[PDB]
Design a protein around this motif. Structure first.
Motif, short mmCIF file in Angstrom:
data_model
loop_
_atom_site.label_atom_id
_atom_site.label_comp_id
_atom_site.label_asym_id
_atom_site.label_seq_id
_atom_site.Cartn_x
_atom_site.Cartn_y
_atom_site.Cartn_z
N UNK C 9 12.49 41.38 56.27
CA UNK C 9 13.68 42.05 55.84
C UNK C 9 14.61 41.14 55.01
N UNK C 10 14.70 39.87 55.38
CA UNK C 10 15.55 38.95 54.64
C UNK C 10 14.97 38.80 53.23
N UNK C 11 13.65 38.64 53.12
CA UNK C 11 13.03 38.61 51.79
C UNK C 11 13.15 39.93 50.99
N UNK C 12 13.02 41.04 51.68
CA UNK C 12 13.24 42.32 51.06
C UNK C 12 14.62 42.45 50.45
N UNK C 13 15.68 42.09 51.20
CA UNK C 13 17.04 42.04 50.70
C UNK C 13 17.22 41.19 49.44
N UNK D 15 31.27 40.24 66.32
CA UNK D 15 31.33 40.19 64.88
C UNK D 15 32.00 38.99 64.29
N UNK D 16 32.18 37.96 65.10
CA UNK D 16 32.72 36.72 64.61
C UNK D 16 31.59 35.78 64.16
N UNK D 17 31.00 36.12 63.04
CA UNK D 17 29.84 35.41 62.61
C UNK D 17 30.10 33.95 62.23
N UNK D 18 31.29 33.56 61.70
CA UNK D 18 31.50 32.15 61.37
C UNK D 18 31.61 31.33 62.64
N UNK D 19 32.33 31.86 63.63
CA UNK D 19 32.41 31.15 64.92
C UNK D 19 31.00 31.03 65.51
N UNK D 20 30.23 32.11 65.48
CA UNK D 20 28.90 32.09 66.05
C UNK D 20 28.10 30.96 65.40
N UNK D 21 28.14 30.91 64.08
CA UNK D 21 27.46 29.81 63.36
C UNK D 21 27.89 28.44 63.81
N UNK D 22 29.18 28.22 63.94
CA UNK D 22 29.68 26.91 64.33
C UNK D 22 29.17 26.53 65.69
N UNK D 23 29.06 27.47 66.62
CA UNK D 23 28.59 27.14 67.99
C UNK D 23 27.09 27.03 68.10
N UNK D 24 26.37 27.85 67.32
CA UNK D 24 24.90 27.70 67.26
C UNK D 24 24.52 26.30 66.62
N UNK D 25 25.23 25.90 65.59
CA UNK D 25 25.00 24.57 65.00
C UNK D 25 25.26 23.44 66.01
N UNK D 26 26.23 23.66 66.90
CA UNK D 26 26.55 22.67 67.92
C UNK D 26 25.45 22.72 68.95
N UNK D 27 24.95 23.91 69.33
CA UNK D 27 23.77 23.95 70.24
C UNK D 27 22.55 23.26 69.63
N UNK D 28 22.38 23.40 68.31
CA UNK D 28 21.27 22.76 67.59
C UNK D 28 21.41 21.23 67.45
N UNK D 46 22.35 36.36 58.26
CA UNK D 46 21.92 37.69 57.78
C UNK D 46 23.07 38.70 57.80
N UNK D 47 23.81 38.71 58.90
CA UNK D 47 24.97 39.59 58.99
C UNK D 47 26.11 39.27 57.97
N UNK D 48 26.24 38.04 57.53
CA UNK D 48 27.23 37.68 56.52
C UNK D 48 26.71 38.03 55.15
#
Lengths: 68, 68, 68, 68
Positions: C9-13, D15-28, D46-48
């Motif tokens: 889907x990401x590639x489709x987009x 729907x707080x995708x920027x916060x989600x990113x910041x915390x997933x990057x910290x988990x990573x 993908x959602x952004x």
């Protein structure tokens, strides 16, 4: 409805107008307020040379959505 | 606009030139720069024998698109 | 299966329809009853202009799930 | 790592995708082999609407765990 309609469109693109009709009618049995499906139904009949049916379905479509 | 115009065309194909005119005028109320709709409007009047209106609308069409 | 499909889907987009196909086929190798993956496969071929393959895969999808 | 990721997920659900990113990057930063965190990172992008980043992170996730 949407998937039946897209199947309909794929057949329309190949010039398979009877198949397209059968699948657009199935999309309409599921969503009778799909202006898109009535319109493409009208297009399909227009391509078969049945202009009186195209009138019928184009009018149902324009009545659901007069914008186009 | 496009759907009104195609309705117009379906009526034109059946020799219903007054209906065709009414629907082409409605397509034009929505997209006044449709050369196709002015032209087919001109065709419709040409078929009714109103050559002075055909001139009028053919000229509006050729002014939007002189290619044809 | 779901992650391959989302990659698809990401590639489709992005309009990368060949990549999308390759990843949807990989999602299907893992879950052959994913109507979603067959459908999006059909969409991908539809976008490449291969309407006969779109027919094929849309029909497999509608046979798993006729609701849409 | 797991708690940062769940914080990430809680923000994703809102729907707080920027916060989600910041915390997933910290988990990573703490567990770079968390397929779950790369995947949800991909989902967040993908959602952004950043499908090229979703591709990037979905591929890192599928390379750690191709099962899904």
């Amino acid at each position: 409805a949407e998937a039946w309609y897209n199947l309909g469109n794929a057949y329309y693109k190949q010039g398979d107008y009877d198949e397209a009709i059968e699948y657009y009618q199935k999309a309409l049995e599921l969503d009778p307020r799909s202006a898109e499906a009535w319109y493409n139904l009208g297009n399909a009949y227009y391509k078969q040379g049945d202009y009186d049916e195209a009138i019928e379905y184009y009018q149902k479509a324009l009545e659901l959505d007069p914008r186009s």
